[PDB]
Design a binder for this molecule. Sequence first.
Ligand code: HEM
Ligand code: HEM
Ligand code: HEM
Ligand code: HEM
Lengths: 311, 311, 311, 311, 311, 311
Amino acid sequence: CPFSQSVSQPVDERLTRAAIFLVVTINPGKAAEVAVRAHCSILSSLIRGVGFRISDGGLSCVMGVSEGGWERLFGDTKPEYLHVFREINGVHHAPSTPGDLLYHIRAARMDLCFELASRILSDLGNSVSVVDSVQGFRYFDDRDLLGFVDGTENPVAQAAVDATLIGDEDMVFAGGSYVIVQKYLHDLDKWNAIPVEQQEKIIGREKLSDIELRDADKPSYAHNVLTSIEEDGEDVDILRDNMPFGDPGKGEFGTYFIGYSRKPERIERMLENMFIGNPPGNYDRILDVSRAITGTLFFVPTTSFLDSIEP
Amino acid sequence: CPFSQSVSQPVDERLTRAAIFLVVTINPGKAAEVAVRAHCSILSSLIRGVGFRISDGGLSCVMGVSEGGWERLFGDTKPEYLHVFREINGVHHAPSTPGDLLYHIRAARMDLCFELASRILSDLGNSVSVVDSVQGFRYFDDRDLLGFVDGTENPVAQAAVDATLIGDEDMVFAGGSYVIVQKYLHDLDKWNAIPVEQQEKIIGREKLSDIELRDADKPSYAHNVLTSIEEDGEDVDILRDNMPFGDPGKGEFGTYFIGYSRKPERIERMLENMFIGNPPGNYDRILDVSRAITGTLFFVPTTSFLDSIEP
Amino acid sequence: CPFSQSVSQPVDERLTRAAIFLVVTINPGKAAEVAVRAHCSILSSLIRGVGFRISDGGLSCVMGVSEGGWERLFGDTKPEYLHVFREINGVHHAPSTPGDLLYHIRAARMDLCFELASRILSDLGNSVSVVDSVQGFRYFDDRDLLGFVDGTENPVAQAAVDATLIGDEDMVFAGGSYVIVQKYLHDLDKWNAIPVEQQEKIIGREKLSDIELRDADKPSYAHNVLTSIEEDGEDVDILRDNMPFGDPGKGEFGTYFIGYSRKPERIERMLENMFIGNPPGNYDRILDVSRAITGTLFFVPTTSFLDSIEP
Amino acid sequence: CPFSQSVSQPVDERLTRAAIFLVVTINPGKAAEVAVRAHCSILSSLIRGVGFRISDGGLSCVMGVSEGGWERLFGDTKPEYLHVFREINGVHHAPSTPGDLLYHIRAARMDLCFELASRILSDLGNSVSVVDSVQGFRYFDDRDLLGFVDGTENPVAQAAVDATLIGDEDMVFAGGSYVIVQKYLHDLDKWNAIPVEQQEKIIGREKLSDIELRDADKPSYAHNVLTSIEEDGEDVDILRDNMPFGDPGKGEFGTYFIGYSRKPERIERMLENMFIGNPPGNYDRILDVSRAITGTLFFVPTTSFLDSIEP
Amino acid sequence: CPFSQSVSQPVDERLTRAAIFLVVTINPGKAAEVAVRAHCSILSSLIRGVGFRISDGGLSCVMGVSEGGWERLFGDTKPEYLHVFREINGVHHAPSTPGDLLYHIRAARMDLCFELASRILSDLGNSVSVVDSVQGFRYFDDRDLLGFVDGTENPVAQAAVDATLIGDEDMVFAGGSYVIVQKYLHDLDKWNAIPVEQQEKIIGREKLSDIELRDADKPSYAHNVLTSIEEDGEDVDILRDNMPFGDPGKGEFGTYFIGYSRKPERIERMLENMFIGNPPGNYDRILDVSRAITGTLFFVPTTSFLDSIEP
Amino acid sequence: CPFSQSVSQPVDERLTRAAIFLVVTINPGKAAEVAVRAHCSILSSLIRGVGFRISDGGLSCVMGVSEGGWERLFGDTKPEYLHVFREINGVHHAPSTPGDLLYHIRAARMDLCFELASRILSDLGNSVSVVDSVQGFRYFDDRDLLGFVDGTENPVAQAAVDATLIGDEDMVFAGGSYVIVQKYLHDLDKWNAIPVEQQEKIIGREKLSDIELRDADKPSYAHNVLTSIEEDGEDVDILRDNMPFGDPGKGEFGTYFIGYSRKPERIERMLENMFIGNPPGNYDRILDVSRAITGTLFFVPTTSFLDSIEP
Ligand code: HEM
Ligand code: HEM
Ligand code: HEM
Ligand code: HEM
């Protein structure tokens, strides 16, 4: 019975009022690998120490390893579906970016994430180089920067566990997951110039009432229509924890999309439908106001596996 | 009876869990001045609209105008003590930076400050250029990044009103104030290498217990000793709302110092004592781990005066 | 593994600060049946949409179908214990009232229940006719209008699951339940004229201390004595969520009794003991100040069964 | 220094999550007048007793007396502006309804208002007859049933005191106020069929962002334009505490408008502008979906005056 | 304008969930007096330091000096009404106990009071000897150990200020107050054996409903009747903050009565009415189940006076 | 499936803001045993009644029986590891104290524990004699009186269940546990005189940051090093709920250590390592400032076993 990381529990508990996405790369050399492998076993103790002081803080941290990082750190067989993120070249472009270790830190207060990230980076020292560091926050009542409520159709409780945690398909990694991260920059002026009814149709839900739309009223290019896919005749869901972020001073507004799954094929299919179009040419209008500049895939191993690594 | 801005009330209410310091400069041309003057009268309506939706949000915004901005916008006589911030050249350097308008936004949640700053910048458009935009947050239990509780000796209720709000010295501006803003970048590795007793003596208070030290145990260069000054034989206090800020990914850690007063002479004297030393050469050791890179002085007029400007 | 509705979880979580009981009847005609069957599959999506926006809202909705409604909607075999509620003619009368669909909506705030009920009724349109619509609220510290704490002896966690959810007795409906609803109108003047010790003995517990009474001090007609019944030599419990309601202007005060079980025989036996008396003539004095005007029985199917209906 | 009732303090404190408007008429006979006059002096003790038990409950009650009630109860000179509410016959009709005593009860929980109203009605007994009894609740984030945030432009702190409390114009009643109550029933289907931009223009603010509109974009019949009036060249504000209410089962949806002032002439002018039109024929479109069925004017005396009445 | 201590503000704010009453005596010798006089000026700094860390903690501390302590510490003229507490010998006995300094510490959490008391005692060292140290806590919903709600008839806001703070009767001490402290030990078995109606009549209010009783139903020996006294034909109120306390293990149950006034004559008259009887022989039945073992009177000077003492 | 008591659930839920440890002895005679056996079956009903009224109160009570109490009450075979606590005579002394029944009461408020303890003692009457009664409270942010965060390394969720609840080693008592209680009195003056770095090394963690220390920096006598033991090559954890307590007036400061386990051998080994030393002579320095005066071992049976006892 391998203990799994806090992947779906924080979402269901619904306490993440602040988050930090930290994508770092391992510097060349064996010493950096040794330092990272040593810090792997103490990550859990750091998590407990940093978040025990602030009760009801909901502090959690998910560590993910990409294909290159896993090749550099653990040379044993890799998971079945672990591979470099595939770029998509359709009506829009989804680039692939370097990354070896992903730290997704969530807490009910920003200071907890700040302290945990500072401790992690200080312990890692010069062994890693920070590639991306995004500080996301909950915007109003679970709304994103486009004004629409996000996260409604996420699976809850047992459904989330069945959708994210890997079963017996890859026993040697039972309890792991696959995470896909992307960063979108929004064109708020263009979105705001769009009439409210057009946004109504594009998203496929309602703005204020957050109630869905009837199948007779949702066009073929609705966001929730293109992202609805099925396997073996049954609909399969993924866990999303998109977080708004930005800096007003530089005029930067964006959303950090993060998706957990037991199979990255589902998320890749959803990305293909959104970018290439299903059928081709029928792309999602959301990409007309949102630009993707960062995208990567990581593997999330079990907590016991992390605690079982010897330097 | 001129209505004063929310200068001391937010501090006493103690609800600022997040803040944004936005220092912008007015672009050359009369059109930019006209746009700023028009937005001046609608700032209050924007504040009310943005912060009424989130009850117990504690949203407040203080707008300050520097000497150059006041000269460009209102050509009538200026306040008595409004002048360009004086740089200090002692054992350390405190630079002076350009700035025309200061927006100090405070709220119990980050999203309110985000929305207010975005609305203000969108309304201002191209008339202003953003010089500095710092997002500060409350760190643990009112502690700064150095680990010491900050804000203990702030005046409360009537004392704060008497210390910040201008009396009859400049009737034509009764209800205004002077605000001095600085940005400090910390060297946390050097501070952490310092023994706990040395930090104990340098700050002049205790770390955990936050209790003061006896006058027989505080050296002449204690931080709370050098910052204690008197006028006409009576001690005079200032209102401080320093806010920690930073980005772990770039390794940036700092504190945004903000000080309100009825007379900037007090804050300038405190800065002279800290940097030059009282007596000279006996500087505060805090500057040995903190570097000042931004410093400016602004004037905060009354709410009625802001509402009374005609474009 | 059929997913069960939120029957016992809201009670154990203890967040229902407001509730709406909506008993409606299906209008004659096949079109109304088709509309209800279509709305059955979208009820869950409506629930999620309406209650995701208000975090920690605890919004839940239980839909129940009576014998006539089940006969009109699904013509396949009915559950084993689904039948028209039996009226009781003893010292008091418990009438039976028409009803086809029951909506029990619970939330921590009244507005969520209001929005959900409005959406449900708007979607149903003219296909249904509202028979009863009662808005109940939590009165002080879980007290009913008679001044006594109610809900103390409810089963918690696993006991509630074993008492409410149907096991293998009716496999084809595993995960369902039976719900019995009644509406009582109180005579508060008569109850208040009764001495505190007489109410002490009638209820069988204490008023303020909410502690029980010794078996030597509880008469044979104590409320908690007559409602304590056993099956096969073992005591069996039922889940109750009685909610006070009323309108001061019309002088209307009452309690909405709702009871969930895996077998309605237990609740019917409890009703027989309370009304007819055990032994006959030894009725509960609570009925001397409370009048029952509405009573109905419904069947609560599983969430998966509701989602699996095709129009 | 006459102590004033909690007229503006509850609004500024912003804790009214539930309210009850109870309009009753005094039955003919001297005994009813004597009973009401006796209960007048014990109303404050009842208020304290009922609301002291639930800390942070924010329980308050405002008692108002109409012209007829004041004539029947106190035969001394009446306030200057106390008169029967004037009906308005323009494009829409605003009826006048009987009423002698008004009880506006507000609390953070519904049960407190329930208990206070029940106690008041029980103490009054048969001396009064209930004419209207409306239970209002806060809908989502201070939004009314039309989906727009209401209460943004209300005066706060000293402005509210100067707008509601009577000064020296009628010394003998210093500290009193005038309250105008109306009940509106909404046609939600017609409002919802209206496009979002048309509602945008009709209300004069924005829906989600709750930010105002520029004077170049608000038509002459915007709701906030017609309700903006001035006295002696200065804009004068009134205090509004409109509360949504309704029953889904009967399909009843409405808003209870309540307005406090030091002079009812302002509210009457606002009503004339909304109904007759300014200029005539340019009425507010809100009345096209809202029907007024109840409207009355009451006088709110000081707490000391209420405590000083001898039976 | 002398600043007054937090005497009435904590009660009106209603945040005291825990309190510590510490009555200590000054050891003989001039050194103890010097140490106490030195700690007097740093008490405020200690208060701020100890309670700034726990936001919304509501930490306050009132220091009072008795007649002997004032004679030993300050040899200048004493307040007009400062004298040794007078023992009362009627049907019951109210003893007088030694005491020089009184510390009434209040906070929303017990740990704050613990820390403040520990710091005060550590700073005082051997200069003082602890006579009494009682840890009181709020019992349920502002109820005392007898089951009745206490504190309902306390003056609020301006009335409390006028009742507690000394006016111009003793200018040299404007802003001070007089505090009377007593400790009562309850006989809960005897009180519980008393019927609920007899307790109803003895207290003079209701138990659950906390509503008063009509003057025709309250006997002459009701607790709220004997404690209602008038000066110059006008009723005068006092501020009470009675706190339940006890230890179950030793079977000790009691109430710590504390009363603030601008004139101790009112509290002494109330004590005479309760113990001797008004008329004599008509004593309060509360003393039949409560025994007084400690009683003392102290003077509370202004905060500025405390800060102005030089060792 | 025997239902287990609330042993690990309250700790994981993290709501114990107040606790009472009540160690009592059974008086000689069969009547006392009969009374205790009768109260055993009603303890659960008392718990539910006392803690249902205060929602989110987190009230729980654990009843434990020592070897002598179990011999006097139930004469059937005892658990495998139930025995009298063994005193330890090394560099320090850990005494053994009499005790028959242990009541560990926990709640989010002190009043709930007070009421429950009072009810339990009143029901027990003269059948038991109170030996120890300690009222503990949470000190600041889960810190003990020594200033270090305590409870960080406690097992959570499934690990706690596996560490505390007895498996199949003693089937007849499956679901029980063993609890070891000790009372330590602290010498705060000696601890405070110790430099912060020496406390840093003695505890083995950090004070403010609550982060652990590297194995190269923790000496052999670190507290967390000596208390880390293994069974069969695997580390085994125990559940600790130490609670600070004391009385400032008497200068009494201490910590009540409580430890739950499926095997008391682990706790006895930890005590031997701390007191005797591992290797001998290398004792924990914590005992140099803390004195143990009370120590006892009890057995905690299942809830079903308690409910199944017949008087
Ligand atoms: C800036 C980027 C995006 C934004 C602002 C956005 C926004 C939204 C919103 C508002 C909804 C409806 C609320 C809900 O269903 O919970 C939604 C639905 C959804 N989106 Fe996105 N989305 C973005 C990108 C993506 C991407 C890249 C994916 C997958 C690779 C994705 C997958 C989904 C899924 C699975 C749903 C649920 C629809 C359903 O279950 O019917 N989204 N999105
Ligand atoms: C206006 C109607 C009623 C009121 C005010 C009322 C009130 C109460 C109260 C105050 C208690 C004790 C608190 C508690 O046990 O949690 C209780 C117990 C109980 N009542 Fe009711 N009751 C009503 C009707 C009913 C009905 C109609 C039934 C069943 C058909 C019922 C079944 C029970 C049960 C099972 C218990 C638990 C007793 C035990 O477990 O020993 N009640 N009731
Ligand atoms: C164990 C001791 C006492 C207990 C349990 C107790 C309890 C109560 C209670 C329950 C009330 C009604 C609640 C309220 O009026 O707020 C009350 C009223 C009052 N008591 Fe006490 N009391 C005690 C001793 C005293 C003493 C010694 C005094 C004065 C020296 C006093 C002065 C008052 C006053 C002024 C009132 C307000 C009555 C009114 O305003 O009409 N009490 N007491
Ligand atoms: C006054 C007495 C004691 C105090 C103040 C104290 C304090 C502490 C502190 C601050 C920690 C580190 C925080 C943590 O690990 O959660 C700790 C660790 C621990 N202590 Fe204690 N302790 C005391 C007595 C004991 C005793 C008597 C035992 C066992 C019989 C014990 C067993 C443990 C254990 C198991 C740990 C966890 C260490 C680890 O998992 O590596 N403690 N103690």
